[PDB]
Amino acid sequence: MTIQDIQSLAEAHGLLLTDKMNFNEMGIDFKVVFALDTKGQQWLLRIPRRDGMREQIKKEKRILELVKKHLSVEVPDWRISSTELVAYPILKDNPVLNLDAETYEIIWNMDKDSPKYITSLAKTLFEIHSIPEKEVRENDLKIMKPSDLRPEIANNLQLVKSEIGISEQLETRYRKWLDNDVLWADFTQFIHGDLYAGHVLASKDGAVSGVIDWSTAHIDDPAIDFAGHVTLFGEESLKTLIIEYEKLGGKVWNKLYEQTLERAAASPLMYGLFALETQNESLIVGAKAQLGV
Ligand SMILES: CC[C@H]1OC(=O)[C@H](C)[C@@H](O[C@H]2C[C@@](C)(OC)[C@@H](O)[C@H](C)O2)[C@H](C)[C@@H](O[C@@H]2O[C@H](C)C[C@H](N(C)C)[C@H]2O)[C@](C)(O)C[C@@H](C)C(=O)[C@H](C)[C@@H](O)[C@]1(C)O
Ligand SMILES: Nc1nc2c(ncn2[C@@H]2O[C@H](COP(=O)(O)OP(=O)(O)OP(=O)(O)O)[C@@H](O)[C@H]2O)c(=O)[nH]1
Ligand SMILES: [Mg+2]
Ligand SMILES: [Mg+2]
Ligand SMILES: [Mg+2]
Numbered sequence: 001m002t003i004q005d006i007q008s009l010a011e012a013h014g015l016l017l018t019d020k021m022n023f024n025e026m027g028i029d030f031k032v033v034f035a036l037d038t039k040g041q042q043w044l045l046r047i048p049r050r051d052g053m054r055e056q057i058k059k060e061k062r063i064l065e066l067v068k069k070h071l072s073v074e075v076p077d078w079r080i081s082s083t084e085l086v087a088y089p090i091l092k093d094n095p096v097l098n099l100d101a102e103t104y105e106i107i108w109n110m111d112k113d114s115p116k117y118i119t120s121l122a123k124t125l126f127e128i129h130s131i132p133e134k135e136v137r138e139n140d141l142k143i144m145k146p147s148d149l150r151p152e153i154a155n156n157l158q159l160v161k162s163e164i165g166i167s168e169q170l171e172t173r174y175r176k177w178l179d180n181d182v183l184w185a186d187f188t189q190f191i192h193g194d195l196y197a198g199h200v201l202a203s204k205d206g207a208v209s210g211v212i213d214w215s216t217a218h219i220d221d222p223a224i225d226f227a228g229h230v231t232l233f234g235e236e237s238l239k240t241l242i243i244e245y246e247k248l249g250g251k252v253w254n255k256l257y258e259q260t261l262e263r264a265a266a267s268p269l270m271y272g273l274f275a276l277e278t279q280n281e282s283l284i285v286g287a288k289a290q291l292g293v
Pocket of ligand 1: 228
């Protein structure tokens with residue numbers, strides 16, 4: 001897409017943009033543009049990459065209106081939310097990490113060992129997970145009960161194995177995990193559902209100030225909101241995060257740490273399931289790579 005193409009799309013939605021813009025291709029769902037309007041306001045544009053995304057756009061809009069009422073940190077304040085374009089004013093701080101546009105390598109915008117990141121991330125996790133189930137239900141978001149989690153993952157495994165394939169090693173791990181009763185919590189809570197450093201905004205000291213990408217939010221296993229952390233920060237950091245979260249009153253179980261590791265390891269299964277649901281071949285090919293087939 002050209003700069004002029006983006007200017008025309010934005011003008012079609014009442015947003016008059018300068019030609020000063022740069023592109024972020026990190027996301028699978030949306031191409032993002034850092035843009036600047038002729039009054040000097042910085043804008044974040046999210047342009048759907050696939051056909052048939054209208055419902056997820058309207059769902060994410062509803063999610064954001066729900067969560068902004070409950071969180072101390074900023075979330076995107078959508079002003080345009082058509083089937084063609086999503087736009088919100090840029091948030092205050094940079095994400096904790098970015099990908100290098102050329103190399104695609106992680107660029108860290110804070111010291112990853114920042115202690116403030118752990119304590120403030122614990123607080124944000126506590127606030128997200130505190131959102132009342134009644135409000136989630138009233139907003140027509142998916143609610144998974146504890147009894148739903150293992151049957152769903154088992155269905156996911158059968159579907160991915162049948163449609164794409166899975167290595168024998170990954171299958172064995174996933175089936176041990178599904179059978180390991182003590183790992184699974186007896187409660188579910190409202191979660192972000194795609195939470196990792198790429199979606200957390202912080203000042204340079206590591207104090208979390210915002211969370212961005214919200215289409216996945218629903219009630220589910222809380223460990224899902226810890227797996228992205230252990231994937232990039234490691235097991236001892238995860239242990240510290242769990243300790244800080246419990247200090248705030250976050251609901252835990254003895255095996256939350258172990259469950260989080262298995263959720264992190266289930267990333268390829270979740271990617272394969274997502275790719276199949278999109279029906280997008282390029283995505284399915286990428287998932288098949290991670291599945292070891
Ligand atoms: C550092 C940067 C890397 O991010 C991660 O590794 C984090 C830690 C994953 O979250 C991990 C951890 C966790 C908990 O998500 C936070 C888990 O749910 C997912 C499956 O895997 C991400 C984000 C996953 O994306 C998410 O995949 C979901 C299936 C759908 C979701 N979105 C489009 C709706 C999408 O953003 C997923 C599968 O790795 C994307 C594929 C394409 C990649 O391999 C890409 C190249 C990643 O390596 C990455 C972006 O470079
Ligand atoms: N600084 C800054 N970067 C942002 C902001 N919103 C999005 N980004 C960047 O744009 C990228 C893609 O935007 P997302 O909304 O995550 O796109 P997506 O397609 O939903 O992403 P995934 O579902 O994770 O694949 C993010 O990973 C950030 O690097 C923002 O408000 N500020
Ligand atoms: Mg994203
Ligand atoms: Mg049990
Ligand atoms: Mg997203």
